[PDB]
């Protein structure tokens, strides 16, 4: 049946077979272990679908395709079921994949500005959109006489105009539309964050854990969109070609080019399936870091030395922050956890971290009257004369709230006795306003000592 022969060289097929087997043995294992691991252990519901659609594609489509579309172009060896089935399955699984990707972008965006049911809607809608493949594809005998058994081939059973509509809509619905929508959400999400980073930078010393996580989420989701554009554009271009050249432009050269482009287009297609477990690992590590950062902020407040040292050892960011810009060391200083202040300083917590209101840990230790925390913060080189947005120094707070011992150690660590806030009030002024005579006296003698120095 010479008319139906492809004439791709043997090596070409052997090379694609080597590549297909590579993608299959690694991709199946990869996507299998991804599901198996979620079964064992919100975002996970999404990564399950993606892992499942790819596993279904690599397990059922790729072996069938390697046989009847790479090696043996005729006849079709899987019946009108296998024909309509292969195409239905593929359309379903890509649709499922594409819609999940839109969900992740939507979910990320909403975070930056029930689920188990939502997943099932995605899959069922994937079955719906894929049904037109059950009516367009089928077996036909294109052999010379019109009855030769070796000319039985799986191929469109409708006219070109009909096939143009399904394929153009398929190109729209499964590829262009959802990937554009994701690109738009990806870009807005990114933009919204980038101003958060500037605003945080303007005030804080450290931007929050929630931002650092969503920031890294934008980059991965961007990579996945770029990944599909590359892996899916050739494929769709090849299927438009099939229904955009009529019959009277199809030269023997253009016929040969198509079956090579088919090997290449469908190599790249299966590559998206085999890369998915990378996205899974990136997303999961991004999520695990956030939870550890979150768990470490609870532990620092609650004063749980054990949980802290487990989280720090297992890689938790010592200098993570909340929306306020509160680090673990801020929380430990504030809650009066001397032991936790010391473990956080050992593991390199920033001693001069500023929150939104420009409060260092020393500010919070000097406000709440923890002499031993003040002493340890200062031992590790805290800013004695660090001033908040109001121009309040730690010595202001110590003097205002009557922490004489803190005043004395602050003074002897080089505190400016004469520091003034926005409203020009000195520690001494604050000491008197509230009625701390012993402090006010210590301060005024310090003030006097400095006068003497000027006049000699």
């Amino acid at each position: 049946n010479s008319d139906l022969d492809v004439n791709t060289d043997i090596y070409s097929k052997v090379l694609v077979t080597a590549i297909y087997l590579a993608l299959f043995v690694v991709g199946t294992v990869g996507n299998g272990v991804t599901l198996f691991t979620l079964a064992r252990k919100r975002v996970d519901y999404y990564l399950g679908s993606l892992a499942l659609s790819d596993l279904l594609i690599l397990l059922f489509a790729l072996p069938v395709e390697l046989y009847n579309f790479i090696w043996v172009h005729h006849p079709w060896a899987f019946g009108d079921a296998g024909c309509k089935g292969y195409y239905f399955l593929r359309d379903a699984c890509t649709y499922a994949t594409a819609l999940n990707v839109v969900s992740l972008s939507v979910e990320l965006y909403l975070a930056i500005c029930r689920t188990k049911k939502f997943i099932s809607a995605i899959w069922l809608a994937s079955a719906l959109l894929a049904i037109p493949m059950l009516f367009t594809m089928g077996l036909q005998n294109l052999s010379g006489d019109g009855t030769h058994p070796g000319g039985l081939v799986c191929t469109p059973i409708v006219d070109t105009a009909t096939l143009r509509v399904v394929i153009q809509l398929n190109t729209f619905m499964s590829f262009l539309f959802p990937m554009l929508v994701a690109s738009i959400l990806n870009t807005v999400a990114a933009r919204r964050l980038t101003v958060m980073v500037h605003q945080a930078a303007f005030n804080m010393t450290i931007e929050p854990g929630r931002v650092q996580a969503l920031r890294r989420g934008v980059l991965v989701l961007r990579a996945v969109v770029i990944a599909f554009v590359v892996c899916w554009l050739p494929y769709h271009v090849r299927r438009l070609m099939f229904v955009y050249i009529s019959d009277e432009q199809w030269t023997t050269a253009l016929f040969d080019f198509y079956h090579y482009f088919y090997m290449l287009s469908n190599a790249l297609f299966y590559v998206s399936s085999a890369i998915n477990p990378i996205l899974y690992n990136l997303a999961e590590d991004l999520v695990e870091d956030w939870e550890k950062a979150r768990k470490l902020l609870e532990a620092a407040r609650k004063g749980q030395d054990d949980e802290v040292r487990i989280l720090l050892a297992n890689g938790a960011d010592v200098n993570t922050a909340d929306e306020t810009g509160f680090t673990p060391l801020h929380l430990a200083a504030w809650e009066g956890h001397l032991g936790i202040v010391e473990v956080l300083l050992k593991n390199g917590a920033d001693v001069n971290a500023n929150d939104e209101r420009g409060h260092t840990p020393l500010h919070l230790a000097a406000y709440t009257g923890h002499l031993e925390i003040v002493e340890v913060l200062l031992k590790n080189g805290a800013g004695v004369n660090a001033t908040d947005v109001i121009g309040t120094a730690p010595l202001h707070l110590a003097a205002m709230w009557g922490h004489l011992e803190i005043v004395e150690v602050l003074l002897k660590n080089g505190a400016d006795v004469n520091a003034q806030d926005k409203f020009g009030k000195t520690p001494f002024d604050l000491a008197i306003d509230n009625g701390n005579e012993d402090i006010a006296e210590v301060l005024q003698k310090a003030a006097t000592r400095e006068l003497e120095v000027l006049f000699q």
Binding site: F69, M137, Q140, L163, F255
Partner: peptide
Amino acid sequence: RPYIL
């Protein structure tokens, strides 16, 4: 014209 899509 090809027959495989």
